[PDB]
Design a protein around this ligand. Structure first.
Ligand SMILES: *C(=O)/C=C/c1ccc(O)cc1
Length: 122
């Protein structure tokens, strides 16, 4: 499955604990509040987080405070409220990591109650 595919969430809805680690891009699944439900191996390779340790933490408050901004978290919240989260943008991640330019794709999951954040280096 390629980053930014039109129906990426269809493919990832099918994936368990293992298949998500084989993606070529970082993949985080969040609930509506930003709590981390899933976090794959490719994302940990970019950020220096242990995927097994971040589960349950809040992405915007605790893990990724540089994303607590209108440009990221504001766009996330707008999408969980509208029910149609689907946006791609560039961003820099720099909290307890080497400042790293990325491309982000946020997309509602098929559950309707969980939201994907996809990341790749640029
Ligand atoms: C800014 O503080 C970004 C930090 C960050 C982004 C994504 C992650 O999975 C971990 C940390």
């Amino acid at each position: 499955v390629a980053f930014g595919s039109e129906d990426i969430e269809n493919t990832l809805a099918k994936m368990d604990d293992g298949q998500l680690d084989g993606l070529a891009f970082g993949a985080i699944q969040l609930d509506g509040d930003g709590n981390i439900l899933q976090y794959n191996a490719a994302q940990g390779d970019i950020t220096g987080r242990d995927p097994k340790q971040v589960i349950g933490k809040n992405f915007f408050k605790d893990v990724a405070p540089c994303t607590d901004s209108p440009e990221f978290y504001g766009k996330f919240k707008e999408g969980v409220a509208s029910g149609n989260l689907n946006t791609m943008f560039e961003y820099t991640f720099d909290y307890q990591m080497t400042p790293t330019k990325v491309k982000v794709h946020m997309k509602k999951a098929l559950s309707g109650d969980s939201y994907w954040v996809f990341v790749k280096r640029v």
